[PDB]
Structures are given as structure tokens and as C-alpha cells.
Amino acid sequence: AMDPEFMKVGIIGAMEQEVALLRSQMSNPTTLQLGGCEFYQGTLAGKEVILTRSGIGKVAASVATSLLLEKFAPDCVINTGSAGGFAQDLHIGDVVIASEMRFHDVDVTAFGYEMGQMAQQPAAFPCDETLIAVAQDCKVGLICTGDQFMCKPDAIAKARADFPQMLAVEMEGAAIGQVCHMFKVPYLVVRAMSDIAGKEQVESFDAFIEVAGKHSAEVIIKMLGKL
Amino acid sequence: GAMDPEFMKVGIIGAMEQEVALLRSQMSNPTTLQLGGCEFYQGTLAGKEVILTRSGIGKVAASVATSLLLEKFAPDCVINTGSAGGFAQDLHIGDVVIASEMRFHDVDVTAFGYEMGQMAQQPAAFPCDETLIAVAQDCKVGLICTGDQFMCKPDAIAKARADFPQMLAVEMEGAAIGQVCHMFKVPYLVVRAMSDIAGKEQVESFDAFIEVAGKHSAEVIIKMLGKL
Ligand SMILES: Nc1ncnc2[nH]cnc12
Ligand SMILES: Nc1ncnc2[nH]cnc12
């Protein structure tokens, strides 16, 4: 047709809680174990998908995404899961759609790069604008990524001062974005909040990870019907 | 030695041109593969079958490069070469450090009871292969830490020193390479040479001595290849 179509869809979640619902909706998925990650291929809500369980953190997400792209060559990558909320009117359970991802813990500013900009990379990784529109159809703005669980006052304050427009944080989104940039593949990050900055985040996370992961995944399921 | 395991196909990774140029020039008619924003050079080097890898800078690029290296070329080990910043007392520009183990200095999930530097679902440290370490020694030994920051401000250096009193040097890819090798279960080693020293005009130092650092590290690797 002449429609913006993504025929093979990659989906990636860090933890079992972020991928279990998706996997359970798949028609007789095939499972591959590779590089410490898991890949499940099959059909889901009508679409051809590769669902990936990456593990937590930038390194794990990067090997997951790079294996996904090299071995399966999807047409786009959608990352789903939970995040920590920073924007004022954000609550537990709220969804944020990323317009772009940045790293909040990257600092090579001694060499002229922007805060959060890794050498040889762009400062930010914009999400595909079609994927954003589809997600909206089913808050939009900046999410930042770092290899730390944000819950101490000073760390939260530094991150707010560095990125005043940051809406939420997590531990994989910008890595996935970077790898997709390195491979030139469209992507999107969708997160639901499992905790809010300054508000008992450890206990919150443990209590809300399951339902936040489901909530995010349900947006993705809705998306798959319109793609 | 006779009792040591063998490594028939050797993977070598450097972040920057300055860290792989010399090694590449000593390869015999290398094939080149461009993929995922990385480059792979396949051929013979100092008598060994090798895949030399130019990864790009930082944890994410190193991770991509190492994933692809391993899944596409399946080498029997991985050796990381390049520059680092010195922390230990008696390090000077150009000095070589062999990693006995890698840790991340910027990873912090301690709120969940993990050690400082330990990523969730990962060990706290990634020990380098017992055979490779000894081969490098035959050609300081200790902890090198990795983070996605160029380390040169006083507060940053002091904190890293506080979290890791045993850290000899810092750089930006080694423990990522180690984690990926751990995930694939493949032997690895990190060798680095100092391009700058903590607190001493590090931006200028790095700019001036990245090439000599890349060189000294690469020379060790060439010698290692001679003994594998
Ligand atoms: N507070 C937080 N920091 C980092 N990653 C998170 N994922 C969910 N909540 C998070
Ligand atoms: N000071 C430094 N910090 C991080 N990586 C480095 N590589 C070389 N020097 C470095």
C-alpha cells in the first residue's frame, strides 16, 4: 500500500513482569535463548512480533536490542515497562510516551559534548513520530535513562537540574534508542509509573511493578492492532 | 604453556581508531565488515586468527560491538585494548595496567541490597580469564572500573576512590565488554595504558597521549598473540 506500515514488530521488556502478559497473548511462540536474553517469535494481536526479555540496565538492553536487530530485522522496536516519575502531575500507574530518550548519567562534557551526550552519538534519540501518534491514539515528552535506581534526594535534584524537562527515569530506554540509532531502525519507548520521585520508591516499586508492567503492555497490545 | 588451555580464534576490541590502527596495520589482507555502526576486521595477526573490532566509545557501543563479535564470529576469547585514566599512586602516562577484574563505578542499585557497582541480575565483578592474565603478565595487575563519564572533576574522582579504594584506573568500556562476555560465557581480558592521570590536566593529557596509550596497550596485545 502507501501506508506507513511496520510488518515485523520488535518488542522489548527488561523484566518478566514487563513481558509476561505479552507473551501469554502470543499464538504458540517459539523461544530462543541467546546471549543471556530470551526471544519469542510469533503472532500477537494479528501482528508478526519478536518479543524480547532483555534483562535490566544499559548493557543488557544493548545486547538484547543488537541481537534482535541482527538476527530478526524487525521494522521497528517498541520498549515497554515501568519507570520512576519526576513530572509534577505524574502518579503511580500513569503512562508516559517518550518523544525522545536521553541518558541522565552520561557525562563527557569535558570534551564539549552536551550533558547526557555520549561521544560519537547524538544528544538525544527521538522516537519515531508515527509510533508516537499511534501510541497517543490508544503525557508525551522526555524520559531519561541511567544505570541507577533513582531514589536519593541529591541524585534526584542533580537529575532535575540537568534535565528540567525530564518526565520520568528508567534503566534501558536510551540504550535501546542508541542501538536503534546505530542500526537506523525506528523505535518508541512507552512506560507506566511504578514509583514517584521522593515517595517511598523502593516499596512502591516492589508493590507496583506488576500492575505498571501490565498497564504498559496493554498500550502496546492496543498499538499492535493499529499498526 | 603446555598445561594452559588454547585459544584458536582471538577477538580483539578497541573503542577508537587510535586504539586499533596499529593492530590493523599488522594484519594480513584484512577483510572488513561494517555493521551496527561498528567495524570488524578479519584476518591473521602475529600468527593468530583474529577478529579485530572498532567498537565506538561508552558502555552501549562496546556492548553492541561485543554482542556482534561474539554472535557473528564466535571467537574463543576477547581481549580489550586501549587507554585509561590512572588512579593508583605510582602510575605514569604510558604505563600499562592488566585487569584481574572489571567493575562498573557508576552502577547504583544499592537501594535493593546490591553491592555498589553491581548491576541487578549480574555478579558484582567480572574476573578476567586466569590464562589470559598470566599471558599478559608474561609479556600492575588489578581492578579497573568502567563508567559512562570522563572522570576528571575532584568530587567525582574522590567519590570513585571512596567506593573503590582498590581501583587502579578508570575507563569507559571494559566492564561492559566483561558483562557481555559473562552473558555469552566467553573468556575475556582488559589491558589498558594510561593516557592521563587523575587530577593532572586530564583533557589536555588525553588529547596529547591517547596515541601513545593506544600504542603501548596494542604492543602488549601483539606480544600476547605471539604466545597464544
Ligand atoms: N526510580 C526508578 N529509577 C530507575 N529506574 C526505575 N524504573 C522504575 N522506577 C525507577
Ligand atoms: N579520565 C578518564 N575517564 C574515563 N575514561 C578514560 N579513558 C582514558 N582516560 C579516561
From Swiss-Prot, chain A:
Give the first-level EC class, as a single word.
Answer: hydrolase
Tell me the domain of life: Bacteria
> Which residues of this protein are catalytic?
18 (proton acceptor), 195 (proton donor)
What is a single molecular function from GO for this protein?
adenosylhomocysteine nucleosidase activity
Keywords, comma-separated and alphabetical: Amino-acid biosynthesis, Hydrolase, Methionine biosynthesis
Q: Name one GO biological process term.
A: nucleoside catabolic process
According to its UniProt record, in which pathway does this protein act? Amino-acid biosynthesis; L-methionine biosynthesis via salvage pathway; S-methyl-5-thio-alpha-D-ribose 1-phosphate from S-methyl-5'-thioadenosine (hydrolase route): step 1/2
State the reactions this protein catalyses: S-adenosyl-L-homocysteine + H2O = S-(5-deoxy-D-ribos-5-yl)-L-homocysteine + adenine; S-methyl-5'-thioadenosine + H2O = 5-(methylsulfanyl)-D-ribose + adenine; 5'-deoxyadenosine + H2O = 5-deoxy-D-ribose + adenine
What GO cellular component entries does it have? cytosol
Q: Where does substrate bind?
A: 84, 150, 171-172
The UniProt record lists the EC number as: 3.2.2.9
A Pfam match is: PNP_UDP_1
Protein's UniProt keywords contain Calcium: no
Q: Which residues cross the membrane?
A: none
HAMAP family, sorted: Salvage_MtnN
Q: What does the protein in this record do?
A: Catalyzes the irreversible cleavage of the glycosidic bond in both 5'-methylthioadenosine (MTA) and S-adenosylhomocysteine (SAH/AdoHcy) to adenine and the corresponding thioribose, 5'-methylthioribose and S-ribosylhomocysteine, respectively. Also cleaves 5'-deoxyadenosine, a toxic by-product of radical S-adenosylmethionine (SAM) enzymes, into 5-deoxyribose and adenine.
Q: What is stated as this protein's family in its record?
A: Belongs to the PNP/UDP phosphorylase family. MtnN subfamily.
Protein name stated in the entry: 5'-methylthioadenosine/S-adenosylhomocysteine nucleosidase
- Please report the organism this UniProt entry assigns to the protein: Aeromonas hydrophila subsp. hydrophila (strain ATCC 7966 / DSM 30187 / BCRC 13018 / CCUG 14551 / JCM 1027 / KCTC 2358 / NCIMB 9240 / NCTC 8049)
